[model samples]
Target: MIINNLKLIREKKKISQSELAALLEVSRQTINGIEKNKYNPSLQLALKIAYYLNCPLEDIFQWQPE
Candidate 1:
């Protein structure tokens, strides 16, 4: 399974969903979907996401053998 700490880290950085979405060139709904685990980001976007968040990709997304 894939899980993420996107919301946690995002809040820690005091970044709003729309703010991050704008930076990533995605819609606010897309960011909401991702944070809610209803969407998976493409690798290209994922890399950008990590870059904007200033964290390793692993810190945001993780793979588990569930």
Candidate 2:
């Protein structure tokens, strides 16, 4: 799986972890962990993120060889 870009794009979108957490009804630590590659978000959550960011899913995530 592709490994990154969550933080970069989030910042570019002017979003903070706390703000995103509230949008998703998740905790800030959850977004932090995902940005750090320490956690995997559920598909529903991931889709919500893409929608919130107004980007295609592939723009934020991609399937790349490890």
Candidate 3:
């Protein structure tokens, strides 16, 4: 299942992948993977992203059955 909402949230926040990566102390490729649903972030990373974006966790992520 794909997690596409990350891209939506990132766009809404007007954040570029490089910007978010700097804030999160991750690589741009990490942000790209997250945006593309190519990777699932750790809970800590997810929470940090939610806090940084000033959004509820659910607003940025959801699970889908395969």
Candidate 4:
């Protein structure tokens, strides 16, 4: 499973979903989907998100294989 830490980072930064979407140049639903793990972002999108959050890519996402 690839778990995303989007909600945690967004909350920590006090940023709304819409705000994050704008920052990422994406739709709010996109942010929602990512947060809910319904959609996995492309590598470019993931890097953009990590850059926006000022976090490492691994800090935003993790792979946990069973």
Candidate 5:
């Protein structure tokens, strides 16, 4: 499954791709790519993403069995 990331949650929190990218020490496009499932970040990066979103890993990354 293409696991979802902090796209909706971040948007819901009024955060932008640039903001999240800066917080996660990545590029803005990286954030966009992640949201679009065009890129998959490393574990550490994923953890950082989860942390910035102030959510559990589940919210940032999902493994829904298809």
Candidate 6:
């Protein structure tokens, strides 16, 4: 499984789901799903999010055995 700190970091950076969604050219539901662990982002999209937030991809997403 993958664990992510998407919501915590996004909130720390004062970014709203709507704002991040607009910047990423995705819908808020997409962002919400990622945060809720209901969906996993594509590598390209994950990289885009990391770049946008000035955070390392590993910091945002980590791997864990289920």
Pairs of colliding residues, candidate 5: none
Q: Write the per-residue lDDT of candidate 1 for residues 1-60, one digit (tens) a residue.
A: 789999999999999998998899999999999999999989998899999888999989
Judged by TM-score relative to the true structure, which candidate is superior, 4 or 6? 6
Please write out the lDDT profile of model 4 over residues 1-66, one tens digit for every residue: 889999999999999999999988999999999999899899999999999899999989998978
TM-score of 4: 0.93
lDDT of 5 by residue, 13-49 (tens): 9998888888877899988888888888888988887
What is the clash tally of candidate 4? 0
How far residue 14's Cα lies from its native spot in candidate 3, in Å, is 1.2
Which of the numbered candidates is closest to the native, going by highest lDDT?
A: 6
State how far residue 37 of model 4 sits from its true place (Å). Answer: 1.0
Cα deviation of 4 in candidate 6 (Å)?
Answer: 0.3
lDDT of 6: 0.96
- Please identify model 6 stretches exceeding 4 Å from their true place: none
* lDDT against the true structure, each candidate: 0.91, 0.88, 0.85, 0.93, 0.83, 0.96
Distance from true position, residue 30, model 4, in Å? Answer: 0.3
User: What lDDT does candidate 5 reach at residue 45?
Assistant: 88
List residue ranges in candidate 2 displaced over 4 A: none
Error of 1 at 21 (Å): 0.7
For candidate 3, lDDT tens digit of each residue in 1-66?
535588888887789989999999999998899887688888999999999998888778876766
Q: State candidate 5's TM-score.
A: 0.87
User: What would you estimate as the lDDT of candidate 1?
Assistant: 0.91
Residue 60, model 3: Cα distance from true site in angstroms: 0.7
Candidate order (TM-score)? 6, 1, 4, 2, 5, 3
How many clashes in each structure? 0, 0, 0, 0, 0, 0
Q: What is the lDDT of residue 27 in candidate 3?
A: 94
Each prediction's TM-score versus the true structure? 0.93, 0.89, 0.86, 0.93, 0.87, 0.95
Worst 10 residues of 5 by lDDT: 1-10
The Cα error of candidate 2 at residue 48, in Å, is 0.4
Task: Evaluate residue 13 in candidate 6 and report its C-alpha lDDT on the 0 to 100 scale.
Answer: 90
User: Residue-wise lDDT of candidate 6 within 1-66, one digit each (tens)?
Assistant: 899999999999999999999999999999999999999899999999999999989999999866
